[PDB]
Structure formats: structure tokens, C-alpha cells
Homo-oligomer: A and B are copies of this chain.
């Protein structure tokens, strides 16, 4: 049964084509769950963090009738289209720490949540104060403009207490995740991003 679902997905999946339905934007939901803050440099304004990037979207062409079969399977992301997300202020490659598999649900939803370690250029001033530093990370589709891909945050506000390591030397005060849009003279179109504002301080 599971082999048959994987076969179906592979027959139907077009890994290089955005799964647009009726010419509508593909809605990509994104939420960073911070796990650790490993290194912070107040002189260079850089941070080194680990987060789970909870990512979901739909490709209805993948759906199947699961009334008498599995309603989810794990799938190598190499078999799937996946959004071309990138952080605008990353200064290192995203290092994926976990198996590169997504879940496909029988209604066509795709769930992908890598643990990623990555370095960013952001405002680290105030990290050793009670009110803390606020490091902003902007994440969006690198090449698809707003007509093609829309990015939506899932949880606008959280202290992340469920996910964050208790052994970090930093503690998280608040994480806000809000829709935002960028445009540059290089690239006329509007591009959606989620702006992740990480408010943290040294313990």
C-alpha cells in the first residue's frame, strides 16, 4: 500500500514546477522554531542559530483516497517540489541536520520540517541587557514573486519555551513572525517574506 502511494506520487510529482491551482499563488506556510543560539558576536553583529523550519504547502494533484489506506507517507524531498526559500540576511549556507524527508498527506498537503543550523547578520546590540537583543531574519522565495508564491507565518507570537534548549547560555524573550514584502531595483517584482524577530538575552 505504501509503495503504491509512493509510486503514485512519483508518477504525478513535478519537482521543478510550482504546484499552482487555477493560476493562483502557492500558499507556503512557514514558522521557525528556535532550538538553540550557539554563538553571538556583539562586535560583528552575527549570530549562529539552530531552528526547525516548519514548512507546509499543498499540491492537490498528489492527493489520494485514504478511506482504506495510509493517509500519510514519508517521501524524499528529491521526489517533490519544495519552495525555494532563502534568508535575505544569511551569511552561511543552511546546514540541514536532519533526514531530508517530507510527509505527504492524502489530501495533498506536504509537510517539511528540517532542523537547520545557519549564521545571520543582524542586530545583536543589547544582548547582555534585560530587554535583550532583537535579531531579525527575513525568509522568502528567492526567485518566485508574490503572484507565484505567497509566504504566510503560522504562529505570529511565541516565547518558544516548548522548543528552545534549556542548556543554551541565552534565553528567548519573544519571537514574532510577521508577513513582510521586499522589492529591490535589481528585481522589479514584489517578493513576500516572513520577518522573524528573535528577541533574546544572555542568561
Binding site for B on A (CB under 8 A): 2-3, 6, 14, 16-18, 20, 31, 33, 35-36, 38, 43-46, 50, 52, 54, 74-76, 79, 84-86, 89-93, 95-99, 101-103, 113, 115, 117, 121-124, 142-144, 162-163, 165-169, 184-187
Contact = CB atoms under 8 A, between A and B. Distances in A.
A79 B169 CA distance: 42
12 contacts: A3-B14, A6-B14, A18-B74, A33-B184, A38-B121, A45-B169, A93-B95, A93-B97, A99-B143, A103-B143, A121-B165, A122-B167
A186 B113 contact: yes
A92 B96 CA distance: 9
A90 B115 contact: yes
Contact of A91 (B33, B38, B90, B93): B38
Contact of A97 (B46, B84, B92): B92
